[PDB]
Amino acid sequence: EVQLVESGGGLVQPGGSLRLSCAASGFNLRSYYMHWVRQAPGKGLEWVASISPYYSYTYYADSVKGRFTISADTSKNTAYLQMNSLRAEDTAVYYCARHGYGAMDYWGQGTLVTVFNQIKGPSVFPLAPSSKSTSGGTAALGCLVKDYFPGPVTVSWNSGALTSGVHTFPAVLQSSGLYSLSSVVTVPSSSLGTQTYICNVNHKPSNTKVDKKVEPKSC
Amino acid sequence: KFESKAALLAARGPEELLCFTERLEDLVCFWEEAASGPGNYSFSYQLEDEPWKLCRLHQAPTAGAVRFWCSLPTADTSSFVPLELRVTAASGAPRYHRVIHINEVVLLDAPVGLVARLAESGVVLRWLPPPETPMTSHIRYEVDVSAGSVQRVEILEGRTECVLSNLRGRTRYTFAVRARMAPSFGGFWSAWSEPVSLLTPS
Amino acid sequence: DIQMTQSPSSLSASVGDRVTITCRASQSVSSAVAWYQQKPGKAPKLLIYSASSLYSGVPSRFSGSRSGTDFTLTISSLQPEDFATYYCQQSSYSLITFGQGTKVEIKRTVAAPSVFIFPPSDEQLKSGTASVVCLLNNFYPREAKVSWYVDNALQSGNSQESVTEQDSKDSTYSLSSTLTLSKADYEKHKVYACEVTQGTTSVTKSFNRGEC
Ligand SMILES: [Cl-]
Ligand SMILES: [Cl-]
Ligand code: NA
Ligand code: NA
Fold first, then answer.
1. Cβ(A115)–Cβ(A108) below 8 Å
2. Which of C96, C160, C162 has its CB closest to that of A47?
3. Which of B48, B52, B92 faces A53 most closely, judged by CB atoms?
């Protein structure tokens, strides 16, 4: 029954603004403390703001003071977080939770705020298996997804038909300022000349999708 | 009556909201804010994940300090479940913020019935539990012997007798016992009992 | 301010082990402290509140205790679902702060990696940049040395690595090291070698440029 449902994240340039929504059902929002907590990708949890019951007193973390505003509308049983003057360091997944037992007992699923400075589509290169691959054994192949921004890219192999033995690596930020990652799969050597392997690279911010037939090279 | 039970605690300082229960099915919280000008505040509490409730505060002079307090309801207090509390200035700035198990803040009455009498031992004290307080099989007591000199003998769960035999002779002695709740329980020392006096032998 | 210093930031234990996480309040603050478990892609889940009380539905192997300024969370007999990240949280009057997190990972037996080297594709060479990629597949533990040699010369700081998290089936890791050179630099050398060190064994995989 009790449920929080967030909306409003997305992509925004530095200095722009975004307004997040937290729809709550199965309890009256007016009679509770509500908090926004955010998580930068690969990082821990950081409290952002709180709002009080019946008086709507607001309290903010030092980092978001002035720029962010927490508020609530009791008729729609929704809480809002209006973010202004957004910085790149604001990029995170944003949760809203509900006070209970002296902590936050019910959390939403979270919405992702991406503050981006450039949009750049990714380059995909084959990671071809060797001819020295273990004959009655296994060989590895993959795709190199180079120089994209902002995140994320998602990779699948054979439109989802190949999942076992796939490792798609975490993105790494190169000193160029762009992201880069690789996705690799181990397969039997006997199937290399029969089976077709396609990595499917999606980079939603550039509205680009790339499909690569990774093939054994030889001469 | 209860005005001197609270009077004990107020010398715990202004930085903490002083709360206590009388029989674990009630609760009272207060703070002292000497007048030199009432103002306005809010008292909110939460019991578990139940919707936050508001306790109506009350004002009263004490002499020349002011005492703001409130009283919780019995259905909220009768469970050993943590209970959050919050006192907030009308500007929103928080004054107090506290979590209590009500069973941990019990303040008892003083024990009654104190008797002193010589033992071939060379003296035996007896006294009764604090009246009109249940769970007497779990009280923690403490005697205090004075001649100037003072010494405090700790007496644990459910004992109402002391066997002090290491005394002086030809000296006046004074005795008083206090009481408090004791490993699934806790609280504050009661006020001292009425004292008993005994002129030692030769 | 209030600081919450959580230690260790990671630990490896086997199934059925006793584990204790500890959280140190930089200072004087209320015992309004709670513990959350978080798993990848999911919100935090409240485990313990009021420093010691089990949240409804949380299994009994979780326990909370305090001593002075030190708050500890203990899991008495680790089960496979308990391997996750854990946060402590402290609330004071208006400020709420979290520990830096602790990651609990599975101890498993040693597993040396499959090692693969990947030369740049001629397709990427046309762009003036060459990426040579080394793959260490399904190994344990995550500690390992990965060294790049170009014509027998050790390379400095022109590589970056990336690690998967522990596999849900074999409890192992996989690593990629990528070496980035200019097309010019790549074309004036012959042997590219990737050497993996782990404990008492180094394993070198290499290719000769132009040789298929
Ligand atoms: Cl994986
Ligand atoms: Cl060696
Ligand atoms: Na991102
Ligand atoms: Na890479």
1. no
2. C96
3. B52
Is B46 close to A100, i.e. CB distance below 8 A? yes
B54 close to A (CB below 8 A): yes
- Three-class SS state of B104: helix
Look up residue A204 and give its DSSP letter.
G
- For this PDB entry, the determination method is X-ray
B14 near C CB under 8 A: no
B184/A contact by beta carbon, under 8 A: no
Pick the ligand that lies closest to the CA of residue A171.
4
Give counts: helices (H), strands (E), chain B.
2, 17
- Positive or negative torsion for Cα C113, C117, C121, C126: positive
The answer to whether the CB of B180 falls within 8 A of the CB of B190 is: yes
CA angle A12, A18, A22 (to 5 degrees): 130
The resolution, in angstroms to one decimal, equals: 2.9
Q: How many degrees, rounded to 5, is the angle at CA A146 between CA A141 and CA A148?
A: 140
Query: What is the C-alpha separation between C102 and C84, in angstroms, rounded?
Result: 8
Whether B98 contacts chain C with CB within 8 A: yes
Find where tokens 């206090």 sit: B178
Cβ(B162)–Cβ(B143) below 8 Å? yes
Using CA atoms, how far residue A67 sits from A70, A85, B42, C117, in Å, is 10, 6, 28, 49
